Design a protein around this ligand. Structure first.
Ligand code: NAD
Ligand code: NAD
Ligand code: NA
Ligand code: NA
Lengths: 496, 496
């Protein structure tokens, strides 16, 4: 430890919530209350929006160059790397994420800030774009400027990282942001506020409001002076936010869950390498990954041998305290999530499916929301386990003979986030790239991504793209500037 | 004039609606029923979505190249131009649009199809974009593909043109589109269906469902198999569509109304040139223009001189049946609109504003929804006339002394679509380009636009951009494709 105790971060200052409420920090490994966070309400949202509006109107932020904002982004990145070990420890204590994964997230945070710092440095030369028109009387160009005040509502699965995926491009674009992290994992996001204080980030450029979704997130979505909402989390929450934004014809982006498939063909070169990618696609982060490859679709010729290697690798996953450097599986984030995940596993048993491994809590761990990595077989398409996102370390399996059957099973979901194809056959991998009904496709792996690439899905996984140039462009207002250069009258109407 | 009688256009066929309902076509100039149109319901929507999905799955649409789609787009453009006189007369009879304006819309339809045919040819070369990663174990690229099934809900003010702004980029991107034109002006959109049949457009590529908003448009927004909604029309309908789309976390774009300002400075070179641009920005299309410059903000030194020129040009506008030569003003589209527009004028009088000219139906025209071009003065910012979009030939006027007052008045709106500045001062025009809280800025003109330019607004005018590359990109699904090229194991987990 120690566990920080912070207030809300608004207009460059620490501010107590108007209603003075607090909500707890629970360590999911021990189930112990380890501290508390401020619980913001609509009165705090109003203050945060006024502070963000003040930033856009001030020279300190609203009139900065992209080069100037890039300096702030880099200074935040350097303070994150300086505090790396402390922040990774807090990330694990708060979320249950392993220390190794928490440390990888911190490096991804630095990399995300650096990527956007570079784009902010290129931004100003692309501010004004002359446009070719088939006319000599008109002169036109496209002007790109910050969109304004943006609300960023983020999830607990990558507490600081998911916040940065939104924060880094919003600040790079010149927007003033109001970040609303999950009430289940707010420590590192509140530490971002302290970092912004340390680097002298201009007042209102970033405002951090912790609290319950309906009380703190909800008012952002219905606020008259929030220009856009960027959301990552559950589909039912996304629908609520979009419904509230519709009343003010306010744009929103939604990065929602998935039921991503991993398709394993009989021509894979190495069974252990493919089995390891399968474990990674489903058990990493205790399966609390939107893009997790939760449905294994395996070719019948290798199914038996591949399942053997998969089960052997799975039973070798070290489940322990997340702070242990060699921990491979932490607990799920909360009691609510623990109950939800165990209910999915029990419903699968009651529907006729087979628990090939896991499905229980580990024997040596009496406390903590620990769920064993679970492999579910003898699964049919009508089962809840096949259709619904579990958000736990739970993999379900179906076999196939033909490529056509694999595509049909792969696309047999209402979601459309990611998908993976494991095969040595280059033309087959290209066919799957086109056929998978998703926003992300992995070939001979599952999960890796880079800042340079667009991230997002389709169907019930939502819309909009995070990262790459898309992340920044989501935060720009586009203007058409059209000038009449001819000295002649329009000559549409009759002169009096 | 012969009025065509058509059925719904679905899966390459003329199809009767399931419930066999039809609704009248009213000529706004005569108030007479001149024919009828099919009235689609939810069962017709279901058939159109299935036809659209079949097109996506068929090699002759879903597997076409951009060059192949470009050939259909150009064939549609050629057919529109061959039938220009017929289509332009039909557009006037249906909507009340002057024949001269209807003819200009047909030139723009052909031009829009031509611009998108060009973009479709370039699309194949940008289908796969390799992305440089600073990695030795991964290779990634961006894949752009059609978004899928798209619902396009369009308004009556530019019946065919507004349909084409959505249809041309949807077909260029390779989507299968379902067009839902306004029940107030559907003749030309049904004629578009006949043109698609004549040119051999593949079945399901474009489906045209005429009918009432809640009956035919509604099920499109709530359909499980519609990937996106593109809407142009009123803010309240936009809100209802986005609300329905939210339950299925379906993306939408909303192009809504505005209360756009025209700012006139005392350094204008010619009073008559600026006065004609002002008439054009408010009276053309009977003021039924989303981007109309409905608020005149005039510098106090030139106000009296400018208003006198404005009155003289205004009183010179020929109001008559829209098919007549030299008609400069047609009627409003419907009885509902007529009453709404006259109600706004009577409310301004009740608020203490002055009706400088017009404000009534013209004396010489006993039939038709004719409203005289109206100029409203002695307006204050609290008045309904200043705040609300009238969507009629109604200009309201305020004076200013300083640039600071002009900017405050210009941005004193909940809307943010377009804005115009009339001044010879180059640096001032540059300051307004930045200062106007809009998506469109005109310099020394009001209304001109080109296909190469992004069109849309911010604030209550909505979000998303039509036209240019934006129009096309709105209809593409973006895919990240990440491949692991290394023969090495991931080495995250412990081998058994
Ligand atoms: O936790 P979870 O796993 O259920 O994920 P979730 O989808 O409910 O949460 C993701 C984020 O949305 C917020 N949120 C929840 N309900 C909200 C609401 N009604 N309005 C606005 N924001 C809301 C959460 O507090 C969190 O920051
Ligand atoms: O009024 P106005 O006609 O001038 O403009 P409007 O905003 O109501 O109409 C624009 C378009 O939306 C359609 N529409 C209307 N109500 C709808 C609904 N509930 N769901 C989906 N589409 C709907 C109309 O038929 C038209 O095609
Ligand atoms: Na926590
Ligand atoms: Na009509």
């Amino acid at each position: 430890v120690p566990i920080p105790r912070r207030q809300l971060y608004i207009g460059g200052e620490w501010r107590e919530p108007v209603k003075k409420n607090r909500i707890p920090i629970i360590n999911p490994a021990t189930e112990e209350i380890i501290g508390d966070i401020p619980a913001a309400t609509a009165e705090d949202v109003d203050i945060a929006v006024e502070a963000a509006r003040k930033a856009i109107a001030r020279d300190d932020w609203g009139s900065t160059t992209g080069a100037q904002r890039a300096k702030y982004l880099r200074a935040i990145a350097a303070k994150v790397l300086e505090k790396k070990s402390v922040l990774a420890t807090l990330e694990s204590l708060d979320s249950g994420k392993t220390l190794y994964e928490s440390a990888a997230d911190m490096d991804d945070v630095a990399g995300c800030f650096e990527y956007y710092a570079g784009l902010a440095e290129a931004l100003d030369s692309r501010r004004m774009t002359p446009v070719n028109l088939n006319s000599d009387s008109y002169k036109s160009y496209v002007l790109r400027e910050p969109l304004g005040v943006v609300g960023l509502i983020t999830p607990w699965n990558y507490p600081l990282l998911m916040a940065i995926w939104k924060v880094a491009p919003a600040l790079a674009a010149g927007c003033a942001a109001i970040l609303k992290p999950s009430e289940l994992a707010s420590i590192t996001c509140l530490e971002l506020g302290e970092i912004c204080r340390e680097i002298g980030l201009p007042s209102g450029a970033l405002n951090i409001l912790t609290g319950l979704g309906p009380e703190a997130g909800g008012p952002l979505a219905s606020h008259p002076h929030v220009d856009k909402i960027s959301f990552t989390g559950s589909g039912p929450t996304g629908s609520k936010i979009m419904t509230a934004a519709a009343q003010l014809v306010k744009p929103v982006s939604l990065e929602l869950g998935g039921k991503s498939p991993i398709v394993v063909f009989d021509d894979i070169d190495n069974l252990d390498i493919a089995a390891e990618w399968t474990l990674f696609g489903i058990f990493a982060n205790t399966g609390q990954v939107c893009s997790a490859t939760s449905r294994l679709i395996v070719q019948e010729n290798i199914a038996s041998a591949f399942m053997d290697r998969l089960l052997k690798w799975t039973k070798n996953i070290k489940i322990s305290d997340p702070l242990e450097e060699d921990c491979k599986l932490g607990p799920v984030v909360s009691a609510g999530q623990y109950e939800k995940v165990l209910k999915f596993i029990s419903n699968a048993k009651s529907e006729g499916a087979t628990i090939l491994c896991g499905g229980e809590r580990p024997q040596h761990l009496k406390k903590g929301y620990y769920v064993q990595p679970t492999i579910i077989t003898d699964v049919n398409t009508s089962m809840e386990i096949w259709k619904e996102e579990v958000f736990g370390p739970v993999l379900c399996v179906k076999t196939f003979k033909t490529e056509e059957q694999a595509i049909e099973l792969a696309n047999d979901t209402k979601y459309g986030l990611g998908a993976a194809v494991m095969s040595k056959d280059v033309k087959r991998c290209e066919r799957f790239t086109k056929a998978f009904q998703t926003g992300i496709i992995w070939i001979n792996c599952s999960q890796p991504t880079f800042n340079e690439l667009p991230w997002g899905g389709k169907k019930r996984s939502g819309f909009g793209r995070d990262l790459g140039k898309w992340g920044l462009e989501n935060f720009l207002n586009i203007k058409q500037v059209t000038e009449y250069t001819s000295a002649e009258p329009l000559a549409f109407y009759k002169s009096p």
